[PDB]
């Protein structure tokens, strides 16, 4: 089972955590809970922004221009990236833009965080036909002492 996880600003703008103008410890914890003990797949740029692997997981970096890092697994195609994850229940795809696009037709589950924040951005989360997806979980939270904006956790399962 292939699942995507993403934080969406208004108009489905996506970016790197350290470049997005918000502070959302509840989202970090949401992210941690849903990716724990699962293999993760990410692109070149996401790998470079994240600085180190997510611990206790297998980290697969999908890139044409492979790197040398000894802690992750370097693949060059979508098929190769799925195989390198092995026979697990759920694979977590974490970005960035192109890699979301590539893994969507193969995806059966989405974890979205809808953040109420207007951010400038060139990259947007792939358009996904809402007829093909069903909401099974939604939870809205106001901004509070620690969280800079209101936000909505959503889980979508295909069909």
């Amino acid at each position, epitope marked *: 089972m292939i699942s995507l996880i993403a934080a969406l600003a208004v108009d489905r703008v996506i970016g790197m*955590e350290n*470049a997005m*103008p918000w502070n959302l410890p509840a989202d970090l914890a949401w992210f941690k809970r849903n990716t724990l003990n699962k293999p993760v797949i990410m692109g070149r740029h996401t790998w470079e922004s*994240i600085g*180190r692997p997510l611990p206790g997981r297998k980290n697969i970096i999908l890139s044409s221009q492979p790197g040398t890092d000894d802690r992750v697994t370097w693949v060059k195609s979508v098929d190769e990236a799925i195989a390198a994850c092995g026979d697990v229940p759920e694979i977590m795809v974490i970005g960035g833009g192109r890699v979301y696009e590539q893994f969507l037709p193969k995806a059966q589950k989405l974890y979205l965080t809808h953040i109420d924040a207007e951010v400038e951005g060139d990259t947007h989360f792939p358009d996904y036909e809402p007829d093909d997806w069903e909401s099974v979980f939604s939870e809205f939270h106001d901004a509070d002492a*620690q969280n*800079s904006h209101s936000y909505c956790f959503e889980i979508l399962e295909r069909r």
Partner: nanobody
Amino acid sequence: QVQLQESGGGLVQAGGSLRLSCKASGIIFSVYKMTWYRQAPGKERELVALITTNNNTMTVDSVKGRFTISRDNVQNTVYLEMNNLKPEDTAVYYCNANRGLAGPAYWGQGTQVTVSS
């Protein structure tokens, strides 16, 4: 070690100005989102302001127009310029740095701000 060190705190009267700084050591400062928090005794720490790696800022409503956050990557320092201070701003202010989803995140030891009136 201690990666982050705040300074600039102290006592001022209402309506006065103050400039806080947080100097980072031993880290690649430019790759961190920086945030200022504050905590009054017993009360929980609350977000004050953040600045991204590409200089996007956000300040919370209670300090809008009074506080300003900036960073100087060359000096490994983030700043909180505070103007028109009010007694309700009295707190220990804490600098925080975060790399991204996998961390690491660092906290300073904090600096006391007391406003009189």
